[PDB]
Symmetry: D2
Subunit: 120 residues, 4 copies
Amino acid sequence: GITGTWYNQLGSTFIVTAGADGALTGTYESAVGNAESRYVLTGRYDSAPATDGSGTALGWTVAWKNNYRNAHSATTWSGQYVGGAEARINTQWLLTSGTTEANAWKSTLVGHDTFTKVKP
Amino acid sequence: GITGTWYNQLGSTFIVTAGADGALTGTYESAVGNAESRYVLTGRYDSAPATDGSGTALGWTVAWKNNYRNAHSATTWSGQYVGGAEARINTQWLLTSGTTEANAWKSTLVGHDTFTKVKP
Amino acid sequence: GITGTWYNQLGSTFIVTAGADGALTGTYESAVGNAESRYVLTGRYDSAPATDGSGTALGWTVAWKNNYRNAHSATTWSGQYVGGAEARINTQWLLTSGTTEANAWKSTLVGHDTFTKVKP
Amino acid sequence: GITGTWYNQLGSTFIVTAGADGALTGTYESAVGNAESRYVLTGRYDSAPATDGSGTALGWTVAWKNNYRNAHSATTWSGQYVGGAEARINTQWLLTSGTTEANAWKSTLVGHDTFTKVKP
Ligand SMILES: CNS(=O)(=O)c1cccc(-c2cc3c(=O)[nH]ccc3o2)c1
Ligand SMILES: CNS(=O)(=O)c1cccc(-c2cc3c(=O)[nH]ccc3o2)c1
Ligand SMILES: CNS(=O)(=O)c1cccc(-c2cc3c(=O)[nH]ccc3o2)c1
Ligand SMILES: CNS(=O)(=O)c1cccc(-c2cc3c(=O)[nH]ccc3o2)c1
């Protein structure tokens, strides 16, 4: 299942609990960027996925403020959990920084992260 | 200035509380506002934004399952709140559907929503 | 319909020709209108769109090198032309910069541009 | 290093010439290897990249019409070429379909493709 400790291809650590009500909660620790130690995450998942072989849709958000640092930014991951002997969560993400209006056209980075239960 | 009701460009509504802890919690629904159109949302925002004129970074997730309906998908919105008399939340979003691996390349839609406090 | 001079919401100027073969060719520049701000574009469009009221799919690329400046980056716009009283091109775009592998996670910006044949 | 035949992670074949003028020209075969599956591509690349370990920025478009078929859609790939013994083109893509205005919110898929010089 989704609940567990996951790592992406960059070595970031995603510690998540999937609640019976569809909630995702936990912490995220980035291996990259303006980031130190753990950040709160919250999100949602489909708690009754299709039974036709499809993955389980989910998403979560981290605002990159904690007691140590504040990057004035937030990332959302949108993806699906795919069961198997090598369980994986495949995502794409949007990282939006707070900007002035003049800089808003460059406010948002996009990428893709794949998570498994092992580090790189 | 984030707490309250916001409206997008297409007759959808959300309703959010921005907690002191950086949490976003509320509901996402239709203009119609019927039970079957309402879904839980959760996310995060920067509770200590820059004071240089920059927007406030935020994001949230809705999984498209409620007690009535299940689309087996989730949307994440990543964006920034821009304050004023003409307050706005400018977002980009990712909507991932659960798929089989053969169909994964087509799992994710992208788009953009702008929210205002004024019911349109 | 596609052939012409288009302007995005930020005042960039897109001078395009839609060839009978599906080709898009032209230049992309900034409002100030200097030679040093002007770059080659190439792309493709659906030369035989549906007849059911749908828009016409298209895309183009600008690499941000000209005889004066090189940003070691490229933008692609993907979207559709919507004909009628006031014709419009609605796009989303990806801007990739050359990075080292360690920085590749932050190589790509995403946004959305709308074009009309009038200035904003 | 860009000119040649490339293969993505899903069996498509990207046949490209990188011109001295920054042009990308070629064919994309969504298949192995029939005429009905071949489409024109055009795009642009940084013809004077850095030699500091950074990738070479680039992008291209396919409109999914040929003499046999027409999906009324176009993909743009935005990314970077990374040279060396294990050369890659790492991309993110946007696939826009022509839609009605009512369906425009769901016009654009996003994903990622990695291309190699050896068949996967
Ligand atoms: C906003 N400034 S920053 O330097 O770019 C920044 C700050 C904090 C964290 C991230 C970060 C981690 C992280 C990850 O693990 N996968 C994808 C995206 C990504 O972004 C990026
Ligand atoms: C009444 N709910 S619904 O029709 O079943 C449904 C199902 C899946 C998705 C969306 C939906 C809305 C919505 C939006 O307002 N911005 C971005 C994405 C997005 O997706 C709505
Ligand atoms: C790293 N290259 S760059 O400095 O970011 C650069 C240089 C010149 C022009 C643009 C540019 C214009 C432009 C636009 O009109 N719509 C979307 C994206 C976009 O990018 C970007
Ligand atoms: C709406 N058009 S379509 O039916 O979905 C269609 C038809 C033929 C080929 C593709 C296609 C291949 C392909 C690829 O290799 N990477 C990225 C996107 C992408 O799209 C898409």
